[PDB]
Amino acid sequence: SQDYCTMLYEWLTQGILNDPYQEFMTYDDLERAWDTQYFIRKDVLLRDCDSEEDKNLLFKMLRTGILLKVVRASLQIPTIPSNSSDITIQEINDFADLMEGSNLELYVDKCYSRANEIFLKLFFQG
């Protein structure tokens, strides 16, 4: 899962989804781009998504992606510069332990914090 991790990290830090094989967790419309409705393909998710916590994780994922996406759409830039904020994130260099737990959510909500701070700064100052 090298480039799979690349895809997931790239989406969590740029909201860009590039799945020419349609394997990623969620997928866009255009099967104008304003009601950017998103759908869950539950058949590929790592968890049963039945209890509250994995639903929480998935929904934070979706929100973070959408937030960064709208940031890019508004500012007319396809890429988010690294140095826009203080919270710096890394790639999933050891997916093995990340999959186990006790770090998955830590990564998820650190990215969530990044998304919230930049997004709120967007609609509060810009």
């Binding site: 508004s74 500012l75 007319q76 140095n83």
Partner: protein, 90 residues
């Protein structure tokens, strides 16, 4: 009848054609590229741009096809009016 023809069929269409062809000429007299409709609908297209914000340390004119397109729209919408049509099912 003549007045109606020249003041409710032709002129209104010509005014719309010049309005669309002219909107590209001006500079922002209002920073909201706004559209006023026949039903009172008000819609803002384009991106709500940031207010020149310094976060970290060009407008839409028409090509040739749009020109031919808009002139043809003007003409045909004149001749699709109920006071000219002769030979359709409509």
């Amino acid at each position: 009848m003549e007045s109606y023809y020249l003041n409710c069929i032709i002129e209104e269409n010509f005014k719309e054609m010049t309005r669309k062809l002219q909107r590209t000429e001006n500079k922002s007299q209002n920073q909201f590229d706004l559209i006023r409709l026949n039903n009172g609908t008000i819609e803002l297209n384009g991106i709500l741009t940031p207010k020149a914000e310094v976060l970290t340390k060009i407008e839409k004119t028409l090509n040739i096809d749009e020109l031919e397109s808009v002139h043809n729209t003007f003409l045909t919408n004149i001749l699709s009016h109920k006071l000219f049509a002769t030979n359709t099912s409509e």
